[PDB]
Amino acid sequence: RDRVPTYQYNMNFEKLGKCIIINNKNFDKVTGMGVRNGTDKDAEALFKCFRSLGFDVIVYNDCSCAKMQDLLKKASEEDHTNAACFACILLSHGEENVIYGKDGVTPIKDLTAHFRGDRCKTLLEKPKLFFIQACDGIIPVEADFLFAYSTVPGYYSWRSPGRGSWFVQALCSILEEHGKDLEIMQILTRVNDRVARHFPHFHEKKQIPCVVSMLTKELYFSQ
């Protein structure tokens, strides 16, 4: 399709923006959580994808809950005046409304709250992307956020111990081929399709990612 103006997020900025990647692979025994084999591959493929897009990617590893909150709060107090958008990618274990650190569990709503319009004035009216990879078949303060969860609330998200989360693999594939020429929703929709088709109490199963959009404009990674 086209590229109609007034309806596109203003990308005429000095830099594309920050891209934090939190890569949690090893968890404390007390959590009962296991090594997320394949997550390192997910983080390398993404760092490479978002750098290629024009992001300043920083990759954190085996973070605690205090670390995860602090780094996001600190990231929100930087000056983003010069950035077109912001993006954060969480790779970890999870459960309804919460994501695991290595020491425990913290609600994602508390992590994303740091960037609400009244709490992060330099990102106001700019897109705040959040990608979350964590756990049968057949102006308003919440505008400009967008979440791409790897599965829907309550089901489990799969991950090849040696190929990486399907969501991540698929996303990286789509971004390499079309990241600078498709709008974000078309990309995430294509990712929904990839995950749906291309991938004994745990045998022959499937999974579908969920996209929650509060965006007020179309987001294109170019021009």
């Binding site: 296991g34 084999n37 394949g38 970890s92 274990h93 756990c135 998200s157 799969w158 991950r159």
Partner: peptide, 4 residues
Amino acid sequence: DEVX
């Protein structure tokens, strides 16, 4: 595969 492994889930989370």
